[PDB]
Amino acid sequence: MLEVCIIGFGFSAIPLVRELARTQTEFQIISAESGSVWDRLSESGRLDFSLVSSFQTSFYSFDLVRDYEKDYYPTAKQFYEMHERWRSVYEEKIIRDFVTKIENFKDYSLISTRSGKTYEAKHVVLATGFDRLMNTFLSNFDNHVSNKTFVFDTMGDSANLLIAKLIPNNNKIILRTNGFTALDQEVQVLGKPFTLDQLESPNFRYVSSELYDRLMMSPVYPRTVNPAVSYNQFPLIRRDFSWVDSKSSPPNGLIAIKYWPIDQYYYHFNDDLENYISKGYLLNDIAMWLHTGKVILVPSDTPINFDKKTITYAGIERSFHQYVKGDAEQPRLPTILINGETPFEYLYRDTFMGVIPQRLNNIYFLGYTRPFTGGLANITEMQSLFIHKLITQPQFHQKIHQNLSKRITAYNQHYYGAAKPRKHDHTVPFGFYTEDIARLIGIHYQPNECRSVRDLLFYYAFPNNAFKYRLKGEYAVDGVDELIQKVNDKHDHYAQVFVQALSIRNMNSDEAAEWDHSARRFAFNDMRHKEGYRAFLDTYLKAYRQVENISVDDTVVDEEWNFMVKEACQVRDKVAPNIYSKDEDVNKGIRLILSILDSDISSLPDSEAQSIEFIRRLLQPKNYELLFIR
Ligand SMILES: Cc1cc2nc3c(=O)[nH]c(=O)nc-3n(C[C@H](O)[C@H](O)[C@H](O)COP(=O)(O)OP(=O)(O)OC[C@H]3O[C@@H](n4cnc5c(N)ncnc54)[C@H](O)[C@@H]3O)c2cc1C
Ligand SMILES: N[C@@H](Cc1c[nH]c2ccccc12)C(=O)O
Ligand SMILES: N[C@@H](Cc1c[nH]c2ccccc12)C(=O)O
Secondary structure (DSSP) of 335-388: EEEETTTEEP---GGGEETTTEESS-SSEEE-S--EESSS-THHHHHHHHHHHH
Over the Cα atoms of the chain, what is R_g?
25
Substitution site in 31, 55, 90 for ligand 1 pocket (most atoms within 8 Å of beta carbon): 31
Residues with CB under 6 A from ligand 2: 183, 196, 199-200, 215-216, 219, 373, 500, 516, 523
Q: Which ligand is nearest to the CA of 429?
A: 2
Residue bearing the CA closest to ligand 2, atom 7 = 216
Tell me how far the alpha carbon of residue 9 lies from the centroid of ligand 1, in angstroms: 9
Q: Which H/E stretch holds residue 95?
A: strand 94-96
Distances (CA, A) of 312 to 220, 500, 572: 30, 46, 21
Distance from C-alpha of 15 to C-alpha of 297, rounded to nearest angstrom:
42
Residue 573 marked as a ligand binder = no
Distance from C-alpha of 380 to C-alpha of 447, rounded to nearest angstrom:
25
Taking a C-beta distance cutoff of 8 angstroms, is the pair 211, 509 a contact? no
Residue bearing the CA closest to ligand 2, atom 10 = 196
Give bridge partners of residue 31 from the DSSP assignment.
96
Q: Which H/E stretch holds residue 572?
A: helix 570-575
Taking a C-beta distance cutoff of 8 angstroms, is the pair 109, 344 a contact? no
Angle, CA of 353, 416 and 383, to the nearest 5°: 15
Breakpoints of the chain, after residues (C–N > 2.5 Å): 579, 607
Q: Which ligand 3 atom is at minimum distance from the Cα of 138?
A: 1
Distance from C-alpha of 92 to C-alpha of 313, rounded to nearest angstrom:
58
Residue 459 DSSP code: I
Query: Each residue of 384-396: b (16+ CB within 10 Å) or e?
Result: bbbbbbbbbeeeb
Q: Which ligand 1 atom is at minimum distance from the Cα of 380?
A: 26
Distance from C-alpha of 379 to C-alpha of 434, rounded to nearest angstrom:
6
Residue 255 marked as a ligand binder = yes
Tell me how far the alpha carbon of residue 475 lies from the centroid of ligand 2, in angstroms: 29
Distance from C-alpha of 303 to C-alpha of 149, rounded to nearest angstrom:
15
Q: Count how many Cα atoms sit within 13 Å of the Cα of residue 498 in the half-sphere of its side chain.
A: 27
Three-state secondary-structure class, residue 195: strand
User: Phi first, then psi: what are they for 415, rounded to 5°?
Assistant: -110, -25
Q: Which of 465, 375, 439, 430 is nearest to 65 (CA)?
A: 465
Q: Which ligand 1 atom is at minimum distance from the Cα of 74?
A: 8
Taking a C-beta distance cutoff of 8 angstroms, is the pair 407, 436 a contact? no
Q: Where are the beta strands (DSSP E) in 421-520?
A: 427-428
Give bridge partners of residue 324 from the DSSP assignment.
152
Going by C-beta distance under 8 Å and a sequence separation of 6 or more, which residues neighbour residue 628? 352, 407, 408, 410, 411, 414, 436
Taking a C-beta distance cutoff of 8 angstroms, is the pair 229, 521 a contact? no
Residue 41 marked as a ligand binder = no
Distance from C-alpha of 479 to C-alpha of 393, rounded to nearest angstrom:
26
Q: Which ligand 1 atom is at minimum distance from the Cα of 374?
A: 11
Q: Which H/E stretch holds residue 184?
A: strand 182-184
- Regarding beta strands 119-126 and 2-7, do their DSSP bridges make them parallel or antiparallel, or are they unpaired? parallel
- Regarding beta strands 257-259 and 182-184, do their DSSP bridges make them parallel or antiparallel, or are they unpaired? parallel
User: Phi first, then psi: what are they for 29, rounded to 5°?
Assistant: -105, 135
Distance from C-alpha of 185 to C-alpha of 598, rounded to nearest angstrom:
32
Handedness of CA 226, 229, 231, 233 (dihedral sign): positive
Tell me how far the alpha carbon of residue 196 lies from the centroid of ligand 2, in angstroms: 6
Residue 201 marked as a ligand binder = no
Residue bearing the CA closest to ligand 3, atom 1 = 158
DSSP string for 121-171: EEEEEE---EEETTHHHHHS--S---S-EEEES--SHHHHHHHHHHGGGT-
Taking a C-beta distance cutoff of 8 angstroms, is the pair 619, 450 a contact? yes
DSSP string for 7-26: E--SSTTHHHHHHHHHTT--
Distance from C-alpha of 85 to C-alpha of 89, rounded to nearest angstrom:
7
Resolved by: X-ray
Burial of 597 (0-12, 13-18, 19+ CB in 10 A): middle
Distance from C-alpha of 245 to C-alpha of 42, rounded to nearest angstrom:
42
Distance from C-alpha of 492 to C-alpha of 494, rounded to nearest angstrom:
5
Taking a C-beta distance cutoff of 8 angstroms, is the pair 465, 57 a contact? yes
Q: Is the CB of 197 under 6 A from ligand 3?
A: no
Distance from C-alpha of 280 to C-alpha of 70, rounded to nearest angstrom:
18
Three-state secondary-structure class, residue 452: strand
Q: Which ligand is nearest to the CA of 38?
A: 1
Tell me how far the alpha carbon of residue 435 lies from the centroid of ligand 1, in angstroms: 24
Q: Where would I find the H helices in 154-301? A: 157-166, 209-216, 230-233, 262-269, 273-279, 286-292
Substitution site in 49, 370, 423, 424 for ligand 3 pocket (most atoms within 8 Å of beta carbon): 370
Handedness of CA 572, 187, 463, 70 (dihedral sign): positive
Domain residue extents for the chain: 1-129+329-523+580-630, 135-328+524-579
Residue 405 DSSP code: H
Q: Which of 475, 467, 490, 429 is nearest to 58 (CA)?
A: 467
User: Phi first, then psi: what are they for 444, rounded to 5°?
Assistant: -65, 165
Q: Which of 247, 64, 117, 230 is nearest to 625 (CA)?
A: 247
Distance from C-alpha of 365 to C-alpha of 384, rounded to nearest angstrom:
10
Residue 442 DSSP code: T
According to CATH, the topology of domain 1-129+329-523+580-630 is: FAD/NAD(P)-binding domain (3.50.50)
Q: Is the CB of 329 under 6 A from ligand 3?
A: yes
Burial of 570 (0-12, 13-18, 19+ CB in 10 A): exposed
Going by C-beta distance under 8 Å and a sequence separation of 6 or more, which residues neighbour residue 482? 65
Distance from C-alpha of 432 to C-alpha of 404, rounded to nearest angstrom:
20
- Annotate 212-224 with three-state secondary structure: HHHHHCCCCCCCC
Distance from C-alpha of 438 to C-alpha of 517, rounded to nearest angstrom:
34
Task: Say how far residue 114 (Cα) sits from the centre of its chain.
Answer: 34
Residue bearing the CA closest to ligand 1, atom 11 = 375
Give bridge partners of residue 86 from the DSSP assignment.
none
Distances (CA, A) of 384 to 19, 125, 221, 364: 8, 10, 33, 10
Q: Which H/E stretch holds residue 83?
A: helix 76-90
Residue 282 DSSP code: -
Residue 100 marked as a ligand binder = no
Distances (CA, A) of 367 to 17, 257, 273, 281: 14, 19, 35, 26
Distance from C-alpha of 508 to C-alpha of 211, rounded to nearest angstrom:
9
Q: Which of 456, 543, 467 is nearest to 502 (CA)?
A: 456
- Cis bond upstream, residue 357 (ω within 30): no
Q: Which ligand 1 atom is at minimum distance from the Cα of 8?
A: 34
Q: Which of 425, 420, 243, 244 is nearest to 329 (CA)?
A: 425
Going by C-beta distance under 8 Å and a sequence separation of 6 or more, which residues neighbour residue 43? none
Residue bearing the CA closest to ligand 1, atom 23 = 11
Give bridge partners of residue 30 from the DSSP assignment.
7, 95
Q: Is the CB of 370 under 6 A from ligand 3?
A: yes
Residue type, 183: L
Taking a C-beta distance cutoff of 8 angstroms, is the pair 80, 47 a contact? yes
Tell me how far the alpha carbon of residue 442 lies from the centroid of ligand 1, in angstroms: 29
Tell me how far the alpha carbon of residue 271 lies from the centroid of ligand 3, in angstroms: 29
- Regarding beta strands 149-152 and 322-324, do their DSSP bridges make them parallel or antiparallel, or are they unpaired? parallel
Residue 525 marked as a ligand binder = no
User: Phi first, then psi: what are they for 145, rounded to 5°?
Assistant: -70, 125
Question: To 10 degrees, the CA torsion angle through 281, 284, 287, 293?
Answer: 130
Taking a C-beta distance cutoff of 8 angstroms, is the pair 518, 587 a contact? no
Burial of 527 (0-12, 13-18, 19+ CB in 10 A): buried
Distance from C-alpha of 409 to C-alpha of 468, rounded to nearest angstrom:
28
Taking a C-beta distance cutoff of 8 angstroms, is the pair 5, 25 a contact? no
Q: What is the resolution of this structure in A?
A: 1.8
Distance from C-alpha of 278 to C-alpha of 544, rounded to nearest angstrom:
8
Residue bearing the CA closest to ligand 1, atom 4 = 51
Question: To 10 degrees, the CA torsion angle through 128, 132, 138, 141?
Answer: 130
Distance from C-alpha of 275 to C-alpha of 86, rounded to nearest angstrom:
28
Q: Which ligand 3 atom is at minimum distance from the Cα of 130?
A: 15
Q: Which of 221, 625, 215, 622 is nearest to 414 (CA)?
A: 625
Distance from C-alpha of 611 to C-alpha of 608, rounded to nearest angstrom:
6
Taking a C-beta distance cutoff of 8 angstroms, is the pair 156, 135 a contact? no
Distances (CA, A) of 460 to 200, 358, 454: 10, 34, 10
Distance from C-alpha of 200 to C-alpha of 298, rounded to nearest angstrom:
32
Distances (CA, A) of 547 to 135, 141, 274, 551, 553: 23, 16, 6, 11, 17
Distance from C-alpha of 287 to C-alpha of 527, rounded to nearest angstrom:
7
Going by C-beta distance under 8 Å and a sequence separation of 6 or more, which residues neighbour residue 292? 530, 534, 537
